[PDB]
Design a protein around this ligand. Structure first.
Ligand code: K
Ligand code: MG
Ligand code: MG
Ligand code: MG
Ligand code: MG
Ligand code: MG
Ligand code: MG
Ligand code: MG
Ligand code: MG
Ligand code: MG
Ligand code: MG
Lengths: 215, 135, 132, 224
RNA sequence: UAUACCGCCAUCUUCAGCAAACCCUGAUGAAGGCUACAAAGUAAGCGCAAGUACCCACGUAAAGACGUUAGGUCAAGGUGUAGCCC
RNA sequence: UUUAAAUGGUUGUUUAUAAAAAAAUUUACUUAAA
């Protein structure tokens, strides 16, 4: 009773049979989630649409991921991934930002319990790949605690709204290293041109930052 | 409920997370035992991939100093007439006896393998061992 | 393909009684006859008038007990007597059943000029032989 | 009021000791060596078994028995705790030379054996195959993890789907990635397989008797 | 108007397949699911089969699913839609 | 490895829910009076 189901896609797939010719089947993608991190998805197939809905709904609950939510409202860090030909680039956002993402990601996020996030889907906009990719990235996100333990260092959060106050969000449960992490003068990191282009005010889009209903 | 995603994490990680979320009302019987005495490696599914290019296995061939003696002995005399009894853990073969005598004479301080090999054979011949050379 | 009096397989959710579940080639092997009289015996007369009477009686009882009949009638004729055996449901009040038995027995006796009896057997629900 | 005390004295107490059932004494490195606990040829090696291989002696992988001892200690400890907790233990093996031996060992220790062809869905479709109220095994011990075409036994994947912990003897050609408590060792030589059966049968029997002794003492004390 | 249908049938059929409900594989794509010294299938129901009729356990009848040909039949009867009512 | 064997008019293929309800009677002779 805690879990809620929401349809993502309904497709009329067809095969050819010797006796009848075109045989119509229903392929249904559904996502189930209780809103507290536990969410899954499944594909249900049946000649009747009701049977397809049921099969997908009941099978999705046996394939539940657990999503680590930072402060139970957003992701811990920005996740960029490619699943097959679909690119999903998700950004961590502050409280009150909303779900500025593809309608399907909005639906899945509400089931997971993420309230604030931005995501841009590029490449193929296949619904199967998007869902499978979204759950792949969110499942693999590293929490602040896991980072502190791996690095043996404090994770200190700097917030602009709190000035210079150092907020320690995670500390290493084991021994704390005494050597500071080597500060590379120039980071050899791969930058997304779309990010850099926006930061330099070089991106004019009439469709970006349009006023939309509360999500 | 449970999670059948056997390729995402481990049974404990999945079970622990679902119990924390409240999906699993009661943790399974094995959960407490696993946590108390966990295995050395967490059982996470990983895909086997072919080694390409210069990648090689780290397994190294097991060799010993006496293998050089054993190889020479087997070439000179061949397999001993006595049949190897591998059931007996303390079984010594004619070749092993040669290695032992060879090593004992190495402690005496002979520095020439050929001379040392000849001396080793002579000591065995004196002890009554049958050493029929291939020739 | 043969069609006559065959209930056709569905998705396994159609309840059929024992009578309607058997096709015509079982009428003397697994199921019996719903009417027993002498008209169709060798050397016997008036098969036509017996048949018309059966067709009327089955329709009369279907409309006189609307929604009550749980299976087909069994019409029995012994000499001058006509006996109608009906398996009905337990939904209609007993008072209404007694009224309809007294009414139908009287009305049918005056119509076919013979003593007519109606024997009701009540079942809680339709007896399901199988789900087709 | 009484349940929590009962659970603490019985269920939680054994979990506070490193070797409550004293499974250390059941085996030594010498005993494992005398049972030929000898891998397959180097050409049969599985990539994931390399951390456990001591080396190759003339192209015959030698399993490191020092790791086997630590892995076996953890496997035998886990098995005992599950038998002490009245868990259903299922022995699975498709090696037909040892099917008779394994089926007897299970019956003798009051556990269960599945040495026959594993039909699709025994674990993931059990409620349909056995019944809605069927209880699945709590532990599955693989004495041979490969089927008869030298591929991982299907139950290894299915046990993980059902979140059932698995103990497994993993030879040098086996894939230990999904086995919870892998024990690197020879799974072919009768001497080796006879040792595993003796070790797991003893650990289960000991654990069950300890559960009866502890319960009896708790009950006698409870009355007076 | 059989190209709206019930009813009763032809045809492949001198076939053996149609399968609900689940499980698994494909990276959770349309789809696919066997090897007995067995390697993912379990399968209610329907047909075949088995039984029954005729002179036998033979033969012949009967039976013969889901579908294919918008196959036949508004002229067996009933009937949706449209039309006629000096 | 090994004869010949051409043709078939045009357009016509697959999405949104599902499902009624009841009813009153109200356990016990004969008679009779003013
Ligand atoms: K008409
Ligand atoms: Mg015919
Ligand atoms: Mg082996
Ligand atoms: Mg037609
Ligand atoms: Mg015509
Ligand atoms: Mg016959
Ligand atoms: Mg015929
Ligand atoms: Mg037949
Ligand atoms: Mg036509
Ligand atoms: Mg032409
Ligand atoms: Mg054409």
């Amino acid at each position: 009773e805690d879990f809620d189901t929401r349809i993502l896609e309904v497709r009329n797939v067809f095969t050819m049979t010797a006796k009848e010719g075109r045989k119509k089947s229903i392929r249904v993608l559904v996502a189930v989630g209780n809103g507290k991190g536990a969410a899954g998805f499944s594909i249900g197939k049946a000649t009747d649409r009701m049977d397809a809905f049921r099969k997908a709904k009941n099978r999705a609950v046996h394939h539940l991921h657990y999503i680590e939510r930072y402060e139970d409202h957003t992701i811990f860090h920005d996740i960029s991934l490619r699943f097959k030909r679909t690119h999903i680039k998700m950004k961590k956002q502050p409280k009150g930002y909303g779900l500025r993402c593809h309608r399907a990601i909005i639906t899945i996020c509400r089931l997971i319990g993420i309230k604030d996030m931005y995501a841009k889907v590029s490449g193929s906009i296949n619904m199967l790949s998007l869902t499978q990719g979204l759950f792949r990235g969110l499942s693999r996100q590293e929490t602040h605690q896991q980072l502190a333990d791996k690095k043996g260092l404090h994770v200190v959060e700097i917030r602009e709204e709190c000035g210079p106050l150092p907020i320690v969000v995670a500390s290493p449960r084991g021994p704390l290293r005494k050597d500071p992490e080597p500060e590379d003068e120039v980071p050899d990191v791969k930058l997304d041109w779309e990010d850099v282009k926006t930061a330099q005010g070089m991106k004019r889009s009439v469709w970006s930052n349009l006023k939309r209903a509360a999500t | 409920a449970g999670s059948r995603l056997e390729t995402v994490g481990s049974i404990f990680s999945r079970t622990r997370d679902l119990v924390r979320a409240g999906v699993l009302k009661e943790k399974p019987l094995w959960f407490d035992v696993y946590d108390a005495f966990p295995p050395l490696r967490e059982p996470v599914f990983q895909r086997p991939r072919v080694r390409y290019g210069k990648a090689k296995a780290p397994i190294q061939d097991i060799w010993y100093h006496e293998d050089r003696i054993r190889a020479k002995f087997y070439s000179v005399y061949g397999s001993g007439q006595r049949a190897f009894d591998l059931f007996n853990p303390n079984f010594k073969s004619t070749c092993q006896r040669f290695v032992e005598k060879y090593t004992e004479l190495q402690k005496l301080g002979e520095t020439d393998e050929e001379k040392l090999f000849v001396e080793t054979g002579k000591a065995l011949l004196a002890e009554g061992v049958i050493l029929r050379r291939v020739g | 393909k043969n069609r006559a009096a065959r209930v056709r397989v569905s998705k396994g959710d159609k309840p059929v009684t024992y009578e309607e579940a058997h096709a015509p080639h079982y009428i003397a092997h697994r199921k019996g006859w719903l009417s027993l009289h002498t008209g169709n015996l060798d050397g016997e007369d008036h098969a036509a008038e017996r048949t018309v009477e059966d067709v009327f009686l089955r329709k009369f009882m279907w409309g006189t007990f609307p929604g009550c009949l749980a299976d087909q009638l069994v019409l029995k004729r012994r000499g001058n007597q006509l006996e109608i055996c009906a398996v009905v449901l337990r939904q209609l009040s007993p008072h209404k059943y007694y009224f309809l038995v007294g009414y139908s027995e009287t009305l049918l006796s005056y119509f076919y000029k013979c003593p007519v009896r109606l024997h009701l057997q009540t079942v809680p629900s339709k007896v399901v032989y199988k789900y087709l | 009021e009484d349940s929590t005390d009962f659970n603490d004295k019985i269920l939680n107490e054994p979990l506070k000791h490193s070797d409550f059932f004293n499974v250390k004494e059941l085996f030594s490195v010498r005993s494992l060596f005398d049972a030929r606990v000898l891998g397959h040829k180097a050409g049969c090696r599985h990539r994931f078994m390399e951390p456990y291989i001591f080396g190759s002696r003339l192209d015959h992988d030698i399993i490191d028995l020092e790791q086997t001892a630590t892995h076996l200690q953890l496997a035998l400890n886990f098995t005992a705790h599950m038998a002490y907790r009245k868990g259903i233990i299922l022995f699975i093996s498709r090696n037909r030379q040892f099917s008779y031996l394994i089926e007897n060992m299970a019956r003798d220790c009051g556990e269960y054996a599945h040495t026959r062809y594993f039909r699709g869905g025994m674990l993931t479709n059990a409620r349909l195959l056995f019944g809605p109220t069927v209880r699945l095994p709590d532990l599955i011990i693989f004495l041979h993890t490969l089927n008869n075409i030298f591929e991982p036994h299907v139950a290894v994947r299915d046990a993980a789907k059902m979140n059932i912990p698995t103990v497994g003897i993993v030879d040098t050609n086996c894939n230990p990635c999904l086995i919870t408590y892998p024990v690197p060792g020879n799974d072919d030589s009768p001497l080796a397989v006879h040792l595993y059966c003796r070790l797991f049968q003893t650990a289960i029997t000991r654990a069950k008797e300890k559960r009866q002794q502890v319960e009896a003492l708790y009950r006698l004390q409870g009355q007076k």
